[PDB]
């Protein structure tokens, strides 16, 4: 598992404590919904660059919650605990280039052909989750509905899954 804090709840006595903000979008086509990533894939991670070493480092623009990382393959997907973080890390973290790190939207929920790489989010058919992706969408700690049932046109922050 890639969570740095095992079993924690998204509870007020919790630190990292987020809202889970869930809007409607008519012009979703039928059985679509629209999920903003909370996932950041960095690209030219260093060989001795590690997931903590990822969290330290991001820890002044945001909270990572997750990282998969492969320093094989020069990369890391990070999932930070609200979409507001992750905008705040591609607005301001390197933008220089002072380190060898290049961020941009990932995708860490539903199909990789729905996602709009510029803006960060998919517009996804319902008929291509599964009845795991559907509960998750509602029952997340971080992210998903809150509750709310997965209706044409709802639109929420990428949920956990597991």
């Known amino acids: 598992n890639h969570h740095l804090y095992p ?8 630190p990292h404590y987020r809202p889970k903000p869930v809007s409607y979008d008519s012009t979703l086509p039928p059985d679509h919904i629209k999920v903003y990533s909370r ?3 960095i ?20 909270e990572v919650q997750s990282v998969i990382l492969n320093n094989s393959r020069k990369h890391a997907f990070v999932k930070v605990y609200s979409r507001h973080e992750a ?7 390197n933008k220089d280039g002072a380190l060898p790190l290049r961020t941009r939207w990932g995708v860490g929920f539903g199909p990789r052909d729905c996602c709009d790489y510029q803006h960060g989010y998919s517009i996804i058919p319902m008929h291509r989750l599964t009845d795991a992706d559907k509960k998750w969408s509602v029952s997340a700690q971080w992210g998903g509905t809150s509750g709310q049932p997965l209706v044409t046109g709802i639109v929420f922050e990428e949920p956990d899954i597991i």
């Open 7 to 14: 079993d924690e709840l998204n509870v007020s006595n919790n």
């Open 87 to 93: 905008e705040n890390v591609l607005q301001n973290f």
């Open 39 to 41: 996932t950041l894939f």
């Open 43 to 62: 690209g030219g991670v260093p060989l001795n660059m590690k997931e903590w070493d990822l969290a330290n480092v991001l820890k002044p623009f945001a």
